[PDB]
């Protein structure tokens, strides 16, 4: 039963014109339908409607990309400008001590010079970056001179690493009782991200992240012996896929990211109070099958007392490269490029002697970004599932397997890319590589803007597809959809590039 306070609350939780719960129940029990809905529809205003606005070939308009200073690189490691100091080594995956491998790779290039800055940070203490590189090199020499190679090396807590890794930077936590009259006491700056425009470099990076390399960046273990015919067909198709995807450079980026995030996570979970030194490593098989090990650069994890799964562990990332920053200065906004050496590479002409650069920067990653970077191998699954779906869909019509001619005969091709001559077709191999590169870049440049844009643009893409199928689409408020889409494009280079692709697709479609 209901009595006392519960009844006094129940008497106040009824439609406005009722006074007691019992009266409301008596009214409802005696209720019988007498055209109330049809009576209120006419009474309601006629301005409340759902007018259908037909969607036609002319209705859609290009998305309104933001305007501002050009965007800059934000990935945790250089993608297109990534030198590799390699040394042939008969080892697999994790075999070997990373520090020993790194020092051995470093002892192959003999052109080291005295570092000097060639593109300052514009906001930092660049001499600090120069001294950090000096200290890292001295520490590598130190470890090399030692008898045994420690599994991990903890850097000395000097002023340069202390500033670069942002130590003692956090304001001291205090209760509000005394910090009340402070003149500048405010709320944490929470404002819309600074708007930035689309640059030309992201397109070139995505281009280079789809080409076929001359190595083998992924070497997968064995699988249970095949017995059923489906297993044999699957093995043939899987050979095709793993050949067409192991040589892509997007797989090199996958492996780099996986290794970097794994190493950072393991080092930050153990040495939560010392500055480690985590060299970047990646191993591949050359075209002749010889094994190799690569050394992109070094990472110096900072103090990493991570509590929530969003905290930040600062790590100054030092990377080699051959590209001079004085060509796309708006892209290297947050780095502190130095000139460390002068390689003597061999080309179709022979010796060329280009200078070598070191792209130093501070950076940070949280305990969730590290996890989702360690789990970066699902890009292969996404792209390969799409390709498998396409191949099976085609092969259903023709009662026989179609993978062989798809990958070898250079048969039916898909429209991928856009050249001045028009849209350029691409074979199934290039479609697989392009989808894999798209997934890898989604993983690398993940952000809320990407999620919002992806959803709000899938909506418009489905509308356009319905138009192209002569289904007579129709929208209630298209302007609202466009405004929602354009609200997501703020400053993320990947989101801007995706919006550019969508504009190009709308241009080519409906025409």
């Amino acid at each position: 039963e209901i009595t006392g306070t519960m009844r006094r609350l129940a008497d106040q939780s009824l439609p406005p014109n009722f006074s007691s719960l019992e009266n409301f129940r008596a009214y409802v029990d005696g209720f019988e339908p007498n055209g109330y809905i049809e009576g209120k529809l006419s009474q309601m205003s006629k301005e409340v409607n759902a007018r259908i606005e037909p969607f036609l070939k002319t209705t859609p308009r290009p998305l309104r990309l933001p305007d501002g200073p050009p965007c800059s690189q934000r990935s945790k490691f250089l993608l297109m400008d990534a030198l590799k100091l390699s040394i042939e080594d008969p080892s697999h995956e994790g075999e070997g001590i990373p520090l020993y491998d790194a020092i051995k790779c470093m002892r192959t290039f003999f052109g080291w010079k005295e570092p000097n800055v060639v593109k300052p940070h514009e906001k930092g203490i660049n001499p600090n970056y120069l001294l950090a590189w000096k200290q890292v090199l001295a520490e590598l020499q130190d470890i090399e001179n030692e008898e045994k190679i420690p599994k991990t090396k903890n850097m000395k807590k000097t002023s340069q690493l202390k500033w670069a890794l942002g130590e003692n930077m956090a304001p001291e936590k205090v209760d509000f009782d005394d910090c009340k009259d402070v003149s500048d006491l405010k709320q944490y700056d929470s404002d819309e991200p600074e708007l930035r425009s689309l640059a030309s470099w992201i397109q070139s990076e995505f281009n280079k992240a789809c080409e076929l390399t001359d190595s083998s960046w992924i070497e997968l273990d064995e699988i249970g012996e095949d017995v059923a015919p489906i297993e044999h067909i699957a093995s043939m198709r899987r050979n095709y896929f793993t050949a067409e995807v192991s040589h892509c450079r997007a797989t090199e980026y996958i492996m780099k990211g996986v290794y970097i995030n794994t190493a950072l996570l393991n080092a930050s979970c153990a040495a939560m109070d010392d500055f480690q030194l985590i060299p970047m490593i990646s191993k591949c098989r050359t075209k002749e099958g010889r094994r190799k090990t690569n050394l992109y650069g070094f990472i110096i994890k900072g103090r990493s007392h991570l509590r929530n799964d969003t905290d930040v562990v600062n790590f100054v990332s030092m990377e080699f490269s051959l590209t001079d920053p004085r060509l796309e200065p708006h892209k290297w906004e947050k780095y502190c490029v130095l000139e460390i050496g002068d390689m003597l590479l061999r080309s179709a002409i022979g010796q060329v002697s280009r200078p070598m650069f070191l792209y130093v920067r501070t950076n940070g990653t949280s305990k969730i970004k590290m996890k989702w970077g360690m789990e970066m191998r699902r890009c292969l699954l996404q792209s390969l599932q799409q390709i498998e779906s396409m191949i099976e869909a085609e092969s259903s019509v023709k009662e026989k397997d179609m993978t062989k001619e798809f990958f070898e005969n250079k048969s039916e091709t898909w429209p991928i890319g856009e050249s001045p001559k028009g849209v350029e077709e691409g074979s199934i191999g290039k479609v697989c590589r392009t989808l894999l590169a798209k997934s890898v870049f989604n993983s690398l440049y993940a952000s809320p803007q990407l999620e919002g844009f992806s959803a709000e643009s899938r909506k418009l893409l489905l509308i356009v597809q319905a138009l192209r199928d002569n289904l007579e689409p129709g929208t209630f408020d298209l302007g609202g959809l466009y405004e929602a889409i354009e609200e997501c494009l703020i400053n993320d280079p990947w989101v801007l590039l995706n919006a550019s692709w969508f504009n190009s697709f709308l241009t080519h479609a409906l025409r």
């Binding site: 030198l83 590799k84 050949a243 040589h247 590479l345 990958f407």
Partner: peptide, 25 residues
């Protein structure tokens, strides 16, 4: 199966910018 991209340009670039040779090898 050995992948072969028509845009291969295996001779177009004088040297791979990322994975060079430098060393006498």
């Amino acid at each position: 199966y050995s992948p072969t991209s028509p845009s291969y340009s295996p001779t177009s670039p004088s040297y791979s910018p990322t994975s060079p040779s430098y060393s006498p090898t």
